[PDB]
Design a protein around this nucleic acid. Sequence first.
RNA 1: GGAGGUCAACAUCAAGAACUGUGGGCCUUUGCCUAUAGAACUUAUAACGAACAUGGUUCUUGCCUUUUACCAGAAC
RNA 2: GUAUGUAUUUAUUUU
Lengths: 299, 95, 97, 185, 261, 48, 68, 157
Amino acid sequence: FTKSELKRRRKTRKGDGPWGSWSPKKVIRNYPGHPEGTTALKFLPKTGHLILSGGNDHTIKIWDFECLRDFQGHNKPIKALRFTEDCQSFLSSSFDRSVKIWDTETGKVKTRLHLNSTPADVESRPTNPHEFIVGLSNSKILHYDDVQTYDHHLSSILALKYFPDGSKFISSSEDKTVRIWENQINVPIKQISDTASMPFLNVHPNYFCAQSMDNRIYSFSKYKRHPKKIHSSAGYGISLAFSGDGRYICSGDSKSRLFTWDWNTSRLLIPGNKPITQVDWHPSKVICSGAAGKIYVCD
Amino acid sequence: SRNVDKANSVLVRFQEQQAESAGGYKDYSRYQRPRNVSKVKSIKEANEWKRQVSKEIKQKSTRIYDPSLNEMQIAELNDELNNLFKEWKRWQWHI
Amino acid sequence: NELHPTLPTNHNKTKLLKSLKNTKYFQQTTIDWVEAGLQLCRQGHNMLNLLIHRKGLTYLHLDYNFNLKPTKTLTTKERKKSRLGNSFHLMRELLKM
Amino acid sequence: DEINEPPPNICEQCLGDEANIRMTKIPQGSECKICTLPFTLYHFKTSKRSNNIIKTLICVRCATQRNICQCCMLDSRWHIPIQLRDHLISLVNEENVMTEEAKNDMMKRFLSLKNVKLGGAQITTKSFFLYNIDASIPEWKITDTVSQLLSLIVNHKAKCGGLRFQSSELGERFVSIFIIPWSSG
Amino acid sequence: MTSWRDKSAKVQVKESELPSSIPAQTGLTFNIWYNKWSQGFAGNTRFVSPFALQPQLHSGKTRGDNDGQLFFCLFFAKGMCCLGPKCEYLHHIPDEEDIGKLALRTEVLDCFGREKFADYREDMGGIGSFRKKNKTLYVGGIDGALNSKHLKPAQIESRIRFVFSRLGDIDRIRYVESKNCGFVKFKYQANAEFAKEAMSNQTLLLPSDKEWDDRREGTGLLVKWANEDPDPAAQKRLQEELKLESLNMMVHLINNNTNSA
Amino acid sequence: DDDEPPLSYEQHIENIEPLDPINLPLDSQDDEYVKDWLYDSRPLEEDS
Amino acid sequence: LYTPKAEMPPEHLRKIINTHSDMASKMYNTDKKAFLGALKYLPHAILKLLENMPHPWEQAKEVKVLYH
Amino acid sequence: MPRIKTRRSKPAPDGFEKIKPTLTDFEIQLRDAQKDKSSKLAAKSNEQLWEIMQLHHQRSRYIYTLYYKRKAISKDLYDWLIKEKYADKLLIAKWRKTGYEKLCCLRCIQKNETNNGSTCICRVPRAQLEEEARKKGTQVSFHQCVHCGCRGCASTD
RNA sequence: GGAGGUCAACAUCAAGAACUGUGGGCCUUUGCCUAUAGAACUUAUAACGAACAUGGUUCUUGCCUUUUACCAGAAC
RNA sequence: GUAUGUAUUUAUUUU
Ligand SMILES: [Mg+2]
Ligand SMILES: [Zn+2]
Ligand SMILES: [Zn+2]
Ligand SMILES: [Zn+2]
Ligand SMILES: [Zn+2]
Ligand SMILES: [Zn+2]
Ligand SMILES: [Zn+2]
């Protein structure tokens, strides 16, 4: 062999010398940048490339999963935000008594839906029908043609979801009930009273729902909880997140009911301001807007 | 004191009450019937309650043919059999 | 100690370590002292756990101060199986120190 | 002493073509897969670089009695499985020489210690519907034969076999002991 | 060739995805030395495998091929292997060539490189014997299908045939209607071992039929080593086969013996 | 306490700085010879 | 022959024990056997550890450990 | 003497600051190497170790280039580093030896440890193993020194 | 070639107040007598260690139901 | 010095 032959020959190995080849949860990131509280968070259902985060400052700040853009246009705080699958649309809803559409392409308000009596605290986008489901202090659920009004709970309606088969709308109210709706006939299919206000629900990506209350997180086709009082999010791995108002993050297994972890966030540079307002998982990461004016990303 | 005392103490029970919530222990070698059938729960459970009967069916069934000669005794034991076998019927019917 | 001398052991020149380091299975480095203390505590605790369970006793718990306590009230045959001698217990006390 | 002094028994076959071989000797290894007693163990590698490792399984005694190879467990001369050589031998003579072995434990743990030897040792959707099938032949033969000429079910109680190709067009091809006929809906 | 030979083997399961150890709550408290549970005995512990293989989809070349190793990855036979092309062992269904390589060492040990034991096992358990070549797998616990009742046994028979049929060349199959068991018989001991380790604790029917999405609650089917065949027919058949094959190797005996002189 | 596992040295302790030891004020004038190396771990390592 | 011992990063050890902390795996069947064996040599390690105490005036002593 | 900031440790020499970022990227990675990322498989474990060993090699190779190639720092900065355990004295000394320039470790040339012979196949040039491979035509089975992760310490490759 | 190393292996370290080699004479190699050369380390309020532990057997005790565990002296 | 002992088969081995 020859020196030239070897010198030329080696560079073939991938990485210099000599290793070059021949041939629980925790807190990843803290994002400040809202002026007010962070009320609601939703994530791009297709590419996972960004957030849409409401605020208490009326804005919406679209974060890269850096801050991309700002969407203004509500006069009052934004309680809920939901992004569409089949559509490039973004439906935001606030305390101003209005459900505003957003065309993601050109970033301008398209449509305003009218006729709530008062602030509208939940929007959920029916998967296959091109419908909107809105609800709020009205104490009624309005099915919007992107038509139906659902008479119902005896108090405000905190959290609403949509499902492709029967009951197509699940609803949760401060009368401490959860109704499973039949929309075509327009009346309650089933009532679930076992809660002693139900402030949050989440749909398992098993065809069930996880319902919340002060001290007891149940499921519906139990979860062990000491007082956690007072959002939920369901990973595709059957992990069930529970945000506290005491600042504790209560993680569960969904099958069992077992609680395998409880964390405590660091407030910020008041001890009352430490809590978790909303939360979501991507399409292995967790995103929680907190009352301290920060979004946190748990890995 | 006979271990009848020692197995029923609080320090024995509490870990069973944790194993029910944290996993699939809790036996069924402990509890009794439960008296009513239709009040039982999801099938994967009554499944074990049912064998918790059939086993005694086997024990006393073997205890039938024994020559040991007590005819009154095997009479009451015979009625106990019939009772249990009826229970077995009931647990099957619920399933 | 002056009255009864010893006069130790020629051929003792072989020491535990000088024999031990020879093998493939031991490697040498430096380190902070307190870190060696903590590691060795972790070592010991794993040793006594594996010896306890290996015997088949899972209801004797070691805390992290090396106190050995029953987690249950014991039936008699437990107390018979579970009597641990002065080897174990002595070494337990020693590590506790 | 007693365990070491008898040398190992290895075939020339599995011991490889290498001229000089380095093997490891452990004075107490696992027990036999047979006698269930300790013995001395030998590693080696056929090739210098061969990935695979060879480990003598049985004793020297538990071998010598049966006259086989410790790595192979084949007969020392003929390279035959033990349950065979005694069948060939048993074909000569008439009925004998079967090796009756040692159930339980100290039955075998006992037995390995006597010097008697053992008997073998002592001397040394288109459905074609298929009929006319011998019960004996395996499906593997049939399909292999079809493949050689150019997917399948059989029932052996029935003696009837059905065949679906992946295309009647194959049907025509093959159509270039049996009852064939071509039918399906 | 065009299927397996060229296309390199692909990762079945991401390493983070692998199931946890420490089987769940068979007893009161966990145990460190043995991995088991401590006091009491929970209802017997068995569960269907979340995993299964896909012979043409997954199987492909690996490092053992270039290294010329003999023995097959069982985590591939379980389709659970996370090492993908980096794996030390072969990923593919045993063929006649490779058994050709193993033929010298197939006597003592199975195709996965594990020594065989002598006695089989009380219940005819995991690995067989090196005394007797046993090509016949007992398939049992057909309730691996869970509770679905089927139009005929051609459902069971057909389905099983299409299951094991992938895994190697099948000599025969008999499902029994009365007592639920299949008896499956292969050309080669190797395929029998590999299939045994491959199909143990598995489910049935279609990638989706009926209760399919609940399949993971099932028990899973026992694949164990099968005893002889008591009926006179196959007993004749064995006696004959042994005869003719003994005859066949007598040819070798007289060829090398003739070379002995 | 018995329930607190021993804290891992690679996290808590290694960052936290030694918090100066005993030593003594010594003297500057009288001890001038021995003031320098008296408290070294190994008192004199490099000297010929 | 005889090249003397090969000194190593501490991080290595830190990873070894760091790893063996949790062991449930079957791959540890030897290491578990390995632990009980070392149980014989521990009190020696207690001695060698305890005679090296850092003393008040020193802050942190640095030692040469020989680990399995 | 110790890695730690202990008061007896003499403060850094002059040229230190310029190289502090480059060293920090190494430190912060070793922190991630011991964090105990769990794995079931052995290969993955000793892979985890291979990470550490290789990192250590890279760092000491960085310093070696600084002082003994570019002479980019003072001698006193250097010796102060060695005494602070930022480099491996013995290892560098092997690098200064004739044929060892690329060496893995101090283990790989240990004659005593290995069962028969010595000196891991980790030290044998690819150019040869390809030839003995050629005799067999089996290609070559070697990938990583089980101690290290090396492929071809030997300085030709 | 010099300096070193919290490196290794192999020697030697309790005795006629004591080591080894060699020259010469007698007995018949040993051994005795005579001549000569070199003697590191450890020893006189005696010893490698300016220090200081444990175990075994055998006796004497001490606690005292019995055994481990022990009480305090001696010899090996 | 709080005995001890026996039994605890669920998954169906070819006529
Ligand atoms: Mg007595
Ligand atoms: Zn034997
Ligand atoms: Zn052989
Ligand atoms: Zn694999
Ligand atoms: Zn190396
Ligand atoms: Zn190497
Ligand atoms: Zn290397």
